[PDB]
């Protein structure tokens, strides 16, 4: 009765914080009641001081309930806990809840914009590596929770509290490399947060930089999460760009940390400057490079801004200029002669048949493997269907059947629809084929479906009126068969038909009116297809088509690179070994750049003599 | 767009008006919740994010940010 | 400044309905043409007048047409004022009642806003929603 009301009034006065003298007299009464217990006194003191239901303490109930007079309350509580020697057992306490598990006063204050209180708590012996592991802090769907790597340092860095970040880095008790329940250190977490500049104003990047300056080591970026990814690979797997543009391009002025950078200028006689990047985890040599992660995944829908970056773009361009152009031309020639021999055969109905039978197996196996790996992959399924139909046609050819030719001819048609694929190589033809695909996916299906609807709706009526028997004269009662009427409508929409009022009909007037309405509706539907095309034609088409072109070209380049053997890959390795700093030899990519605007005495350079060799 | 969404909402309200009272009551869009000064009223919960503005959240109904 | 002077006097009658039955708020809602024209000052006066009188009376009353100021802004093509009304977050602990937009919890940038649906839902005779949707004017 009195004790429960006492505890309730304690927490209520904390939530209100109307007067610290109230709390002083109240904690004095608590200390006076403490004398009643002789043994196990501090545990009971905590229990009367702690909400055992949720595992919550009065200090947390205070920090949650912010008021201007909170600092004095916290000082009083901490001085009391020190006078009774429960400071450590009091600060480090956390919740017992399933979602709030691990939350502490420090993470509360940092979830708030208050840092001084956090400093006071840390001076009192507060834990800094507090891992808050809970459904709240480890949610799904980004709703009803908030993920930040589950550390106070990560919480402060994500929330733009750099002073507290410096504090938490200053203490030796800090564990920068501390991995969370998910395995993500603070870098991974920052990478999980950097939505976009328009949303954040690019503070996460500054914190990334500051943290890497605070720890001059490659330890963090070398780490891997439970998924098995470096934070670079993590940003790539996600839709993060500005952070990646920062990472892949770093020029540091500090000669001591000069090793941590990945971009370098080796000489600059003036406006000229031969910048020098790195390729450690970027080239395809790694298990899952940044390039693969960017190119293969369609889960992002941001890969254009990703690939437009300097090193990736230059790597793609060089790999196409070296071998992929020739490989594409070569596959094109193979398919060219393949389909030409196929035509020669199908027209006149041994060497060409053998060549076709030999070359079909490679395509078949490659298509099967691609499907096992798998609207970008439509072409693979189409080639697979083509090869399947061809092998079926030949198998039928061996047998004494007659349907074989049908399959064969179908393949031919499909085959000549597949050469469009190779047109995608050329930039003009690239945007050409991509416009084909986008239009056939977006606008044409609507037209076709609703036009089939109208075909049925009007052809049923046309056949109904044509139900008037011609006395066994198919020429008299045109539109007699339903399919016949639909075929006549098709000829009409193309204009081949020979329309005429049919005496074999009960009503020529209604027939003509309905036909005219059908023609009008078909014209208007075609016209609306054209309008819906023109509506997006100008702005989205060009950009989307060029983005898709570059993306699919990179995909093809990586595919062909994966097709090659180890030794040829070793031969075509782009980049060059270079001495960076302190007996460090790493791979690099060279880009000669020119700048007439930014003038500066070039202080930092690898090579004194600007000579290319 | 303005015509499409508008007609959609109009027809949504039409369907809602076609119903009887007891079904509507059953559905009960919105949750009853407590507001300060000993008040109880209907409310609608919407989760939203704001990165640009940072501030100490003095005005909060529940101390614990738990969904339940 | 003149509005402050007028509200400070005890003889003043803020709740005075005109011959048409409209309060101050209905009148202001009859004036909010658009932002490009006014520069959004009427919203400020709405806020100030509400803060001068901590009650629900003004928003509760009706005109001779029988409509709240909210229902009136919905009846007219008035958006900015409505955007304000339907989303009010007052930091004043005393006047917290008048607010309709409430923050249930804010751990960080994520936060659950708790809007209000007293006369907005279809339960009422004429909700804000039906009013907005069923008028082509």
Swiss-Prot record, chain C:
ANK repeats lie at residues 23-55, 65-87, 123-137. It is found in: Cell membrane; Cytoplasm; Lysosome. Abundantly expressed in CNS. Widely expressed at low levels. Detected in dorsal root ganglion (at protein level). Expressed in the keratinocyte layers of the outer root sheath and, to lesser extent, to the matrix of the hair follicles (at protein level). Homotetramer. May convert from a homotetramer to a homopentamer to allow pore dilation. Interacts with TRPV1; may form a heteromeric channel with TRPV1. Interacts with SNX11; this interaction promotes TRPV3 trafficking from the cell membrane to lysosome for degradation. Belongs to the transient receptor (TC 1.A.4) family. TrpV subfamily. TRPV3 sub-subfamily. Non-selective calcium permeant cation channel. It is activated by innocuous (warm) temperatures and shows an increased response at noxious temperatures greater than 39 degrees Celsius. Activation exhibits an outward rectification. The channel pore can dilate to provide permeability to larger cations. May associate with TRPV1 and may modulate its activity. Is a negative regulator of hair growth and cycling: TRPV3-coupled signaling suppresses keratinocyte proliferation in hair follicles and induces apoptosis and premature hair follicle regression (catagen). It is linked to Olmsted syndrome 1: An autosomal dominant, rare congenital disorder characterized by bilateral mutilating palmoplantar keratoderma and periorificial keratotic plaques with severe itching at all lesions. Diffuse alopecia, constriction of digits, and onychodystrophy have also been reported. Infections and squamous cell carcinomas can arise on the keratotic areas. The digital constriction may progress to autoamputation of fingers and toes. Palmoplantar keratoderma, non-epidermolytic, focal 2: A dermatological disorder characterized by non-epidermolytic, abnormal thickening of the skin on the palms and soles. Focal palmoplantar keratoderma consists of localized areas of hyperkeratosis located mainly on pressure points and sites of recurrent friction. This is Transient receptor potential cation channel subfamily V member 3. It comes from Homo sapiens. The gene is TRPV3.
């Amino acid at each position: 009765r009195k004790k429960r009301r006492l505890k309730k009034r304690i927490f209520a006065a904390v939530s209100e914080g109307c007067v610290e003298e109230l709390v002083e007299l109240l904690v004095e009464l608590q200390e006076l009641c403490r004398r009643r217990h002789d043994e196990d006194v501090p545990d009971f003191l905590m229990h009367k001081l702690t909400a055992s239901d949720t595992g919550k303490t009065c200090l947390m109930k205070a920090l949650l309930n912010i008021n201007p007079n909170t600092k004095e309350i916290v000082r009083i509580l901490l001085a009391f806990a020190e006078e009774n020697d429960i400071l450590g057992r009091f600060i480090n306490a956390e919740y017992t809840e399933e979602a709030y598990e691990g939350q502490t006063a420090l993470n509360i204050a940092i979830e708030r914009r208050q840092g001084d209180i956090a400093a006071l708590l840390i001076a009192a012996g507060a834990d800094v590596n507090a891992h808050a592991k809970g459904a709240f802090f480890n949610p799904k769907y980004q709703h009803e929770g908030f993920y930040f790597g589950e550390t106070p340092l990560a919480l402060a860095a994500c929330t733009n509290q750099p002073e507290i970040v410096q504090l938490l880095m200053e203490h030796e008790q800090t564990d920068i490399t501390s991995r969370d329940s998910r395995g993500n250190n603070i870098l991974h977490a920052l990478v999980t947060v950097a939505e976009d500049f328009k949303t954040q104003n690019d503070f996460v990047k500054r914190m990334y930089d500051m943290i890497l300056l605070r720890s001059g080591n490659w330890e963090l970026e070398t780490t891997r999460n439970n998924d098995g990814l470096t934070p670079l690979q993590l940003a790539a797997k996600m839709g993060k760009a500005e952070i990646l543009k920062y990472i892949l391009s770093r020029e540091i002025k500090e000669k001591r940390l000069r090793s941590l950078s990945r971009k370098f200028t080796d000489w600059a006689y003036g406006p000229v400057s031969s910048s020098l990047y790195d390729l450690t985890n970027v080239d395809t040599t790694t298990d899952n490079s940044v390039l693969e992660i960017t190119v293969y995944n369609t889960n992002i829908d941001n890969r254009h801004e990703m690939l437009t970056l300097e090193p990736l773009h230059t790597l793609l361009h060089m790999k196409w200029k070296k071998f992929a152009k020739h490989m594409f031309f070569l596959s094109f020639c193979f398919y060219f002669f393949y389909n030409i021999t196929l035509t020669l055969v199908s027209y006149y109905r041994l060497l060409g048949r053998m060549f076709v039978l030999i070359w079909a197996m490679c395509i078949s196996v490659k298509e099967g493997i691609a499907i096992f790996l798998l609207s970008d992959a439509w072409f693979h399924f189409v080639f697979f269907i083509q090869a399947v139909l061809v092998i079926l046609s030949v198998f039928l050819y061996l047998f004494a059947y007659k349907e074989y030719l049908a399959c064969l001819v179908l393949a031919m048609a499909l085959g000549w629809a597949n050469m469009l694929y190779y047109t995608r190589g050329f930039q003009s033809m690239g945007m050409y084929s991509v416009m084909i695909q986008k239009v056939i996916l977006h606008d044409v299906l609507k037209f076709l479906f609703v036009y089939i609807v109208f075909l049925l709706g009007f052809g049923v009526a046309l056949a109904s009126l044509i139900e008037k028997c011609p006395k066994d004269n198919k020429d008299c009662s045109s539109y007699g068969s339903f399919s016949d009427a639909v075929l006549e409508l098709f000829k009409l929409t193309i204009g081949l038909g020979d329309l005429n009022i049919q005496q074999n009909s009960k009503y020529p007037i209604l027939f003509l009116f309905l036909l005219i309405t059908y023609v009008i509706l078909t014209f208007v539907l075609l016209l609306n297809m054209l309008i819906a095309l023109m509506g997006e034609t100008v702005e989205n088409v060009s950009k989307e088509s060029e983005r898709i072109w570059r993306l699919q070209r990179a995909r093809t380049i990586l595919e062909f690179e994966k097709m090659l053997p180890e030794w040829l890959r070793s031969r075509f390795r782009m980049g060059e070994l270079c001495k960076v700093a302190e007996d460090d030899f790493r791979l690099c990519l060279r880009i000669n750049e020119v700048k007439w605007t930014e003038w500066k005495t070039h202080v930092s350079f690898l090579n004194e003599d600007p000579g290319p060799v």
